[PDB]
Amino acid sequence: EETRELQSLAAAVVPSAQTLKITDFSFSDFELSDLETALCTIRMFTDLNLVQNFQMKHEVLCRWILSVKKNYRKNVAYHNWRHAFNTAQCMFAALKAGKIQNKLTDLEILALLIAALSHDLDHRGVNNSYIQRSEHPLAQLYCHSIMEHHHFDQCLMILNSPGNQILSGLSIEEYKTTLKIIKQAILATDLALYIKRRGEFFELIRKNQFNLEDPHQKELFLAMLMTACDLSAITKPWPIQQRIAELVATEFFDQEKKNKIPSMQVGFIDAICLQLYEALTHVSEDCFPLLDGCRKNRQKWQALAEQQ
């Protein structure tokens, strides 16, 4: 058992990117089995040249993927393996379809994919902070990045695990740089951090001073990209988005029915999502499909919200 799943995975052919649909921003995972997401994930690595460039062994990447999947909680409604998988998927799409691959280094890409996949490891549920309570008090500094420090702890734990060391093909200098960025990438998924840094990102777009050769503006962009992907369900074709909002809602009430939801989706869109997917689109307007999706979802939640 469990060694079960790996034999299946290690053996099977990985369908192409076209065949798995992973290049579409409109991607949906609902039909897929856990087994099929694993394959999608391998394809993500392979088609980003990561298996080649960092000489990853196939058995190892497979065991890492299942270990990552294993370490989410199915009992949690939204913050689970499928959320993480979708975030990686979105990061895939944004690199290929949104043409961001060409604006980044290989280590950068490697670290973002591992980050995205790993960015909510061990999440227990939004209203259900056991990570918070049974911790050292002196969690009052409120680095908020505190859940996110847990996630990175767990990301590093798996990375290091025997069988699972997909970064062992790196040089010690490469490994250090990569991990640095995984850390920043996962901590960037704290929304408090996004709120605190987006002004700078939007100013540079507004004032037209934006420049990725500046190492500081690189890191910034990577935090913003991570957030974009993490939220990206908000951009999905309406009937997917609705279902995802349902899971979000389950978790946000269960540790004035669907009634509350529409107003809250619009709130969240307006407060957070809209401006980000606008900015991303200025940087690369092949990412427009996310903006478009975000807006179309807004029209639809607004219309319903008005007691249709």
Output the known binding site.
Answer: 83, 119-120, 230, 265
Indicate which residue of 58, 79, 123, 151 is catalytic.
Answer: 79
Query: What mask of x and - would describe binding to Mg ion in positions 112 to 131, judged by CB under 5 A?
Result: --------x-----------
Per CB under 5 A, the segment of 48-56, 112-120, 169-177, 210-218 that binds Zn ion is 112-120
Among ligand 9T9, Mg ion, Zn ion, none, residue 12 binds (CB under 5-8 Å by kind): none
Name which of 63 and 69 has its Cβ closer to Mg ion.
69
State the minimum distance, in angstroms, from the CB of residue 306 to Zn ion: 30
110 close to 178: Cβ distance less than 8 angstroms: yes
Sequence-ordered alpha helix ranges (H) in the chain: 3-11, 17-20, 34-47, 50-53, 58-70, 81-96, 106-118, 130-133, 147-160, 172-188, 191-206, 215-231, 238-253, 260-268, 274-283, 288-305
247 close to 205: Cβ distance less than 8 angstroms: no
- Which of 225, 233, 283, 305: binder of ligand 9T9 (CB under 6 A)? 233
Is 136 marked active-site?
no
The closest alpha carbon to 122, from 160, 152, 142, belongs to 152
Own/partner contacts of 194-199, CB < 8 Å, gap of 24 or more, are 194/223, 194/224, 194/227, 194/272, 194/276, 197/223, 197/224, 198/224, 198/275, 198/276, 198/279
Q: Please list every residue from 184 through 213 that binds Mg ion, using CB under 5 A.
A: 189
Tokens found for residue 307: 């007691």
264 touches ligand 9T9 by CB under 6 A:
yes
Q: Please list every residue from 36 through 95 that binds ligand 9T9, using CB under 6 A.
A: none
61 close to 273: Cβ distance less than 8 angstroms: no
> How far is 151 from 120, CA to CA, in rounded Å?
5
Residue nearest to ligand 9T9 (CB): 252
143 close to 149: Cβ distance less than 8 angstroms: yes
Per CB under 5 A, the segment of 93-101, 183-191, 211-219, 254-262 that binds Mg ion is 183-191
- Which of 230, 235, 236, 279: binder of Zn ion (CB under 5 A)? 230
58 close to 10: Cβ distance less than 8 angstroms: yes
In the annotated binding site for Zn(2+), the residues are: 83, 119-120, 230
Q: Please list every residue from 160 through 199 that binds ligand 9T9, using CB under 6 A.
A: 191
- Which of 47, 108, 120, 190: binder of Zn ion (CB under 5 A)? 120
Binding site for Mg ion (CB under 5 A): 120, 189
Q: Interface with ligand 9T9 by CB under 6 A: which residues?
A: 126, 129, 191, 231, 233-234, 244-245, 248-249, 252-253, 260-261, 264-265, 268
Annotated catalytic residues are 79
